[PDB]
From Swiss-Prot, chains A, B:
Contains the P2 globular region. It comes from Turkey astrovirus 2 (TAstV-2). Residues 1-202 are annotated as: P2 globular domain. Disulfide bonds: none annotated. Belongs to the astroviridae capsid polyprotein family. The chain holds residues 423 to 630 of 724 of the full protein. This is Capsid polyprotein VP90. The lineage of its organism: Viruses, Riboviria, Orthornavirae, Pisuviricota, Stelpaviricetes. It is found in: Virion. Specific enzymatic cleavages by the host yield mature proteins.
Length: 203, 203
């Protein structure tokens, strides 16, 4: 019936992970073809404080490197999360986290990889907090500053987990953190390439 | 039944400008009760380069100050814009720009003011591009860095215009600009208060 508020909207078929107004598939190979917008949710387990100097996220193995940091955040974007399409498309919000379930396990999409613990170079305690299973979907992302991050789908509890570091304490209640948009980051892009490629405004 | 992509969705009644999980009214007096998320649309006329040292936005005659700047942006958020509700609500996206038309002219809402040209200190060229009418809705906003901005509803063509400055040229095709989230900024808040009050994560 109602579709607003969006978290309450009924499921709808969406043709592809990213699609245009003609219903055609838009490949996820390029940087910036989808944007994650959300009010993330945090719990007492979200904030992890320890310096990790050569952090990585592993996938099926190989990996993508992350910036060294002391503040690690495991946030849930399942309830309010939406994906905006690449700006040239004009599609705006073209998935909710619920509709995205139709495509999150589509390993054929270049953006989506299978999580691999073995090449994930993170503290033991942090891996424990992530509570992921080998093969869970993982997506390379970056914020608007080019700070690499990962979006996971934790299949065991059907939660979309946004994992990223911050330069400073986000606060015990996450009061300090002012969230940024996250955009998909191609596996072949360096940080400079990601920033150069990224568009956030339709022209 | 079909609401994605969102720009195409049929209008739906929404009870209030901001509302909770069961449709009850939420006051807009405080900072950070709503968030504008969009992929804005730009044209050649969107970008204006001139240094303005004491820029202000006037409303009914009084005003709110903006940061001194030389790069001015008049962007259209009608196509993809949505409003997320305050994080404590867990309500997520609760208006589209189309549904928002139901409430945008509700001057009883504390967040919404009537635009007044007389106390708006910007030059003729900028005012000409804004193309506003006295009394058009204006909302004081800020980005996640606490940079004050204005969201306007130009009643004449029913377009939502986001007006803000940048520190550098966004580019001829807006290629350089990486958009930030914008949150409502209470008329009684200083920049420090806006940043202190603002929450972008639910705990």
């Amino acid at each position: 019936s109602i579709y607003l508020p969006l978290p309450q909207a009924d499921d709808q078929y969406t043709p592809y992970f990213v699609y245009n107004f003609q219903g055609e598939r838009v490949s996820t190979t390029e940087t910036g073809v989808f944007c994650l917008a959300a009010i993330p949710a945090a719990t007492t387990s979200s904030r992890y404080n320890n310096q990790i100097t050569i952090p990585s996220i592993g996938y099926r193995g190989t990996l993508f490197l992350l910036d060294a940091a002391s503040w690690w955040n495991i946030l849930d974007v399942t309830q309010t999360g939406v994906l905006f399409g690449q700006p040239r498309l004009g599609v705006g919000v073209m998935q909710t986290m619920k509709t995205l379930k139709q495509h999150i396990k589509d390993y054929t999409e270049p953006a989506i990889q299978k999580y691999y613990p073995g090449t994930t170079n993170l503290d033991e305690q942090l891996k424990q907090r992530l509570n992921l299973a080998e093969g869970d979907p993982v997506i390379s992302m970056g914020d608007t500053n080019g700070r690499r991050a990962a979006l996971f789908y934790r299949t065991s509890d059907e939660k979309y987990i946004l994992f990223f570091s911050t330069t400073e304490d986000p606060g015990a209640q996450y009061q300090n953190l002012k969230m940024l948009y996250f955009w998909n980051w191609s596996y072949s892009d360096t940080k400079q390439q990601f920033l150069d490629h990224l568009r956030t405004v339709q022209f």
